[PDB]
Amino acid sequence: MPREIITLQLGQCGNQIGFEFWKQLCAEHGISPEGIVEEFATEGTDRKDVFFYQADDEHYIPRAVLLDLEPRVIHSILNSPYAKLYNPENIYLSEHGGGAGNNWASGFSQGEKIHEDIFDIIDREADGSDSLEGFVLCHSIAGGTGSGLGSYLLERLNDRYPKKLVQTYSVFPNQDEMSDVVVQPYNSLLTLKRLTQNADCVVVLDNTALNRIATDRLHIQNPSFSQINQLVSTIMSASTTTLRYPGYMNNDLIGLIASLIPTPRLHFLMTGYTPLTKTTVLDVMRRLLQPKNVMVSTGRDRQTNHCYIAILNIIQGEVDPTQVHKSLQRIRERKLANFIPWGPASIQVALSRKSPYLPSAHRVSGLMMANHTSISSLFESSCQQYDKLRKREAFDIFKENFDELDRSREVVQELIDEYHAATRPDYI
Amino acid sequence: VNKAAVDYFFVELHLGAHFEALRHFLLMEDGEFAQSLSDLLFEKLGAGQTPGELLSPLVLNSVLSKALQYSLHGDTPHAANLSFALKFLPEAFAPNAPDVLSCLELRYKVDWPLNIVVTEGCLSRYSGIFSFLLQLKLMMWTLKDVCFHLKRTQFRQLQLFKHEMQHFVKVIQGYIANQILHVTWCEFRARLASVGDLEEIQRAHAEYLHKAVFRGLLTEKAAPAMNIIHSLFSLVLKFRSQLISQNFALMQQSYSTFKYYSHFLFKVVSKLV
Amino acid sequence: NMKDFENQITELKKENFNLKLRIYFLEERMQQE
Amino acid sequence: MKDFENQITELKKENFNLKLRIYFLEERMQQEFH
């Protein structure tokens, strides 16, 4: 009864991230990006089938379909063999050049029409799994296509795999750049609705600190989309470090994520990277305690109280256990990072180990998931940005009626308030 | 003569291989096996299929083989040699108290005459460690089933209460053996066979095993602590069943009792060591 | 436990059968001779 | 467990009867063939 981590790339950015993540899973497992796994992957504890399912030619085929709203994302991915580990059907680029039209309403329409296609692809890619967790939707909420497809295909995939999960990832637009089309609000609304309705966790990405990291920390000033794709590949390799490869604890890394996702309404988590462009447990905590030092903009807003209740970090790296206990005690008791303010004296932090071929910038490569009402405040900001196409009528989910977008913005604000209550001992 | 005999017994007699495979299977070394169990396998016996059905020989043997196969660490010969022993036959499987599944006891195998230094203490300690691991796994699988039933389709803070309850248990298990105690226990058993007589080598091995058990604070005077933990675990199992159904009161009481019993256990630990 | 008893029953079925078969073969040989 | 133990005892009795008859037949063979 082995396990495999499935995914699905949606949108142009989503499919670029999907190809980069297939390459990253291959590399971290030890599979060459050209579509063949080197024999060095077998020696390590990194299980290719967990992240980039090795083909008969050792092609570490990710259990994901590379579908792009802009088909040019995968049209030129054929020349680059970085997605050759995936099966030809595994690179399932969307036929439409506009995909779902970069409109949140059309995105929901396309995801629901692809419901049969999404369910069929899930069934086709579910063969390689014995004790897996579920599929994902590696998409981008920047254009409404990505977020609408995320929500609609999430409903469709929940229909196809009810006992499993299909985690939608709403990679919203660049928070440092204004969008040309203002229909993204219904996209953020649909993503927040998919989060709060059933999914215990949901992904929301803000590019405010991320743009600064890319321009200066990553030094990619005025870069192309490749910088974002490379960052997505690095994050996927970091996740495969704890999923595909053996660490030191937290056999249920998904269980830890579900612990930080204790409620469908509180579906927001804060990511933290340290370094993000020599780390004792305390040093790593000092290097990533602040949301700014973190890799995700868990909103420091008031709709959700920007107090991190619980944290769980994939700190890939083997620190000493005495130091780990001392740093956990310092966080818990010394109020450096206390437990959920709704809980007694405890620590809310985790750690991981890197993949067989995945390195760490410090003693522990940081990629966190902090169940924080600051992340809920980021969701609140997304809810406030979810009315741009409804209140101002800017630019199915919104075209057929604004019920989806407006109710989703209201639900996002309500979840922000609920997480504001849950950052402190008044969660109820 | 004593040194030569000890070296011959300790070099490649598979006796320490028995202990290694016990720590690999009786204690589930491969996280894949535990994850597969809590995801798909921990369905029937987790709540208790039946007093007679859950004790079926062929089904239990198939389940053990499947758990060993799901992990590329339970392939050790003594991993499959982990056998079944019992003191009380199955009687009830109500998923209200912590009685989820604690019937099976893992018993690995060693070489002979490596049992020259075999006393009842070390085997009893190993069996008790396996039983405690089984009970903790039953609680964790009840929580996992609660989460799965909640996700299949008045219940807030249930996952937070589960994490708060599990933190201390995880800390104790890591103290017993995580990465440092994981080698300290091995080093203690590495000095288990250094005597000129089998009785003294047995004493060294039993001392290492007892120190490993004492790492978890397994003192026999802690029967009241066992009762308090039993009440807490009954509440935990009831809350897991309630969360599988859709309790919020159980979760809030779990958090409050976690704080209170943490204070009580801190006082007890200060009073004892 | 019960696994040892189950294995004992499985072996003992064949044990009783083999003792009876040996007796029957001896009886057939004695009747022929 | 106990039912299997009782079955083991019953099979022990069955082997007892069969093998006592076998010993008697060996006695008959020693009386006849020699």
CA-based nearest residue to A161, from A128, A113, A119, A200: A119
Hey, how many other C-beta atoms are within 10 angstroms of the C-beta on C27? 14
Distance from CA of B70 to the nearest CA of A (A): 4
Report whether A93 contacts A73 (CB < 8 A): yes
Which residues in C lie closer than 8 A to residue D19 (C-beta atoms)? 19
Chains meeting D at 3+ CB pairs closer than 8 A? C
Residues of C with CB under 8 A from a CB of D: 1-2, 5-6, 8-9, 12-13, 15-16, 19-20, 22-23, 26-27, 29-30, 33
Three-state DSSP state, D7:
helix
Q: Which residues pair with A308 in a beta bridge?
A: A372
Question: Residue C6's closest chain B neighbor by CA?
Answer: B57
Dihedral sign, CA of A204, A209, A214, A215?
A: positive
Q: How far apart are the first and last CA of chain B?
A: 42
What is the Cα–Cα distance from A85 to A30, expressed in whole angstroms? 12
Q: How many residues does chain B have?
A: 273
Distance from CA of D16 to the nearest CA of C (A): 8
**Elucidation technique:** cryo-EM
Phi and psi angles of residue A111, each rounded to the nearest 5 degrees, phi first: -65, -40
Give the count of alpha carbons within 13 A of B48, CB side only: 18
Q: Does B102 touch chain A (CB under 8 A)?
A: no
Residue with tokens 């990505």: A146
Strand-pair category, A203-205 with A52-54? unpaired
> What's the token pair of residue A92?
């399932």
What is the Cα–Cα distance from B134 to B139, expressed in whole angstroms? 9
Give the count of alpha carbons within 13 A of B208, CB side only: 21
What is the Cα–Cα distance from A223 to A2, expressed in whole angstroms? 40
CA-based nearest residue to A349, from A376, A326, A331, A374: A331
With a CB cutoff of 8 Å and minimum separation 6, the contacts of D15 are C12, C15, C16, C19
What is the Cα–Cα distance from B202 to B29, expressed in whole angstroms? 25
Q: Does A126 touch chain B (CB under 8 A)?
A: no
* Mutate: best of D19, D29, D30, D34, partner C, most C CBs <10 A: D19
Exposed/middle/buried for B255, CB within 10 Å: 0-12, 13-18, 19+? buried
Distance from CA of B36 to the nearest CA of A (A): 5
**Rg for chain D, CA atoms, rounded:** 15
Give the count of alpha carbons within 13 A of C29, CB side only: 14
Q: Which of residues 393-422 of A touch B (CB under 8 A)?
A: 422
Chains D and C contact (Cβ–Cβ under 8 Å for 3 or more pairs): yes
Cα A199 to Cα A167, A191, A194, A389, B169: the distances in Å are 7, 11, 7, 25, 28
CB contact under 8 A, C9 and D7: yes
Cα A375 to Cα A266, A293, B265: the distances in Å are 9, 14, 34
Hey, how many other C-beta atoms are within 10 angstroms of the C-beta on B20? 18
Question: Residue C15's closest chain D neighbor by CA?
Answer: D15
b or e along A323-332 (b: 16 or more beta carbons within 10 Å of the residue's beta carbon)? ebbebbebbb
Q: Indicate the helix (H) or strand (E) that contains C21.
A: helix C3-32
CB contact under 8 A, B84 and C3: yes
> What's the token pair of residue B153?
């389709």
CB contact under 8 A, B57 and C1: no
Report whether B139 contacts B236 (CB < 8 A): yes
Residues D10-17: contacts with CB under 8 Å, at least 24 apart = D11/C8, D11/C9, D11/C12, D11/C13, D11/C15, D11/C16, D12/C12, D14/C12, D14/C15, D14/C16, D14/C19, D15/C12, D15/C15, D15/C16, D15/C19
Distance from CA of A42 to the nearest CA of B (A): 13
HEC string of chain A? Answer: CCCCCECCECCHHHHHHHHHHHHHHHHHHCECCCCCECCHHHHCCCCHHHHEEECCCCCEEEECCECCCCCHHHHCCCCCHHHCCCCCCCCCCCCCCCCCCCCHHHHHHHHHHCHHHHHHHHHHHCCCCCCCCEEEEEECCCCHHHHHHHHHHHHHHHHHCCCCEEEEEEECCCCCCCCCCCCHHHHHHHHHHHHHHCCCCCEEECCHHHHHHHHHHCCCCCCCCHHHHHHHHHHHHHHHHHHCCCCCCCCCHHHHHHHHCCCCCCCCCECCCCCCCCCCHHHHHHHHCCCCCCCCCCCCCCCCCCCEEEEEECCECCCCHHHHHHHHHHHHCCCCCECCCCCCCCECCCCECCCCCCCCCCCCECCEEEEEHHHHHHHHHHHHHHHCCCCCCCCCCCCCCCHHHHHHHHHHHHHHHHHHHHCCCCCC
CB contact under 8 A, B156 and A3: no
Q: What is the DSSP letter of D33?
A: T
Q: Where are the alpha helices (DSSP H) in D1-34?
A: 2-32
Chains A and C contact (Cβ–Cβ under 8 Å for 3 or more pairs): no
Which residues in C lie closer than 8 A to residue D5 (C-beta atoms)? 5
Q: Indicate the helix (H) or strand (E) that contains C28.
A: helix C3-32
Question: Residue C19's closest chain D neighbor by CA?
Answer: D18
CA-based nearest residue to A171, from A226, A108, A96, A229: A229
Omega cis (within 30) before A275? yes
Which residues in D lie closer than 8 A to residue C32 (C-beta atoms)? none
Q: Which residues pair with B247 in a beta bridge?
A: none
For this entry, resolution in Å reads 6.8
CB contact under 8 A, B164 and A130: no
Distance from CA of C16 to the nearest CA of B (A): 23
Q: Which of D1, D21, D33 sits opposite C23 (nearest CB)?
A: D21
Distance from CA of C33 to the nearest CA of B (A): 47
> What's the token pair of residue B77?
């010969």
* Mutate: best of D6, D10, D11, partner C, most C CBs <10 A: D11
With a CB cutoff of 8 Å and minimum separation 6, the contacts of A8 are A18, A64, A65, A67, A118, A121, A122, A135, A136, A137, A138, A139, A153, A166
Q: Does A25 touch chain B (CB under 8 A)?
A: no
Distance from CA of A247 to the nearest CA of B (A): 10
Question: Residue B85's closest chain C neighbor by CA?
Answer: C1
Omega cis (within 30) before B224? no
CB contact under 8 A, B55 and C1: no
Report whether A252 contacts B38 (CB < 8 A): yes
Report whether A201 contacts A258 (CB < 8 A): yes
Show me where chain A is broken: residue before each gap, C-N > 2.5 A: 277, 395
* Mutate: best of B28, B35, B136, B152, partner A, most A CBs <10 A: B35
Q: Which of A249, A263, A344 sits opposite B259 (nearest CB)?
A: A344
Strand-pair category, A165-171 with A203-205? parallel
Chains meeting C at 3+ CB pairs closer than 8 A? B, D
Q: Which of D11, D22, D28 sits opposite C13 (nearest CB)?
A: D11
b or e along A258-280 (b: 16 or more beta carbons within 10 Å of the residue's beta carbon)? bbbbbbbbbbbbbbbbbebeebb
Phi and psi angles of residue A421, each rounded to the nearest 5 degrees, phi first: -65, -35
Chains meeting A at 3+ CB pairs closer than 8 A? B
Phi and psi angles of residue A280, each rounded to the nearest 5 degrees, phi first: -70, 165
CB contact under 8 A, B164 and A249: no
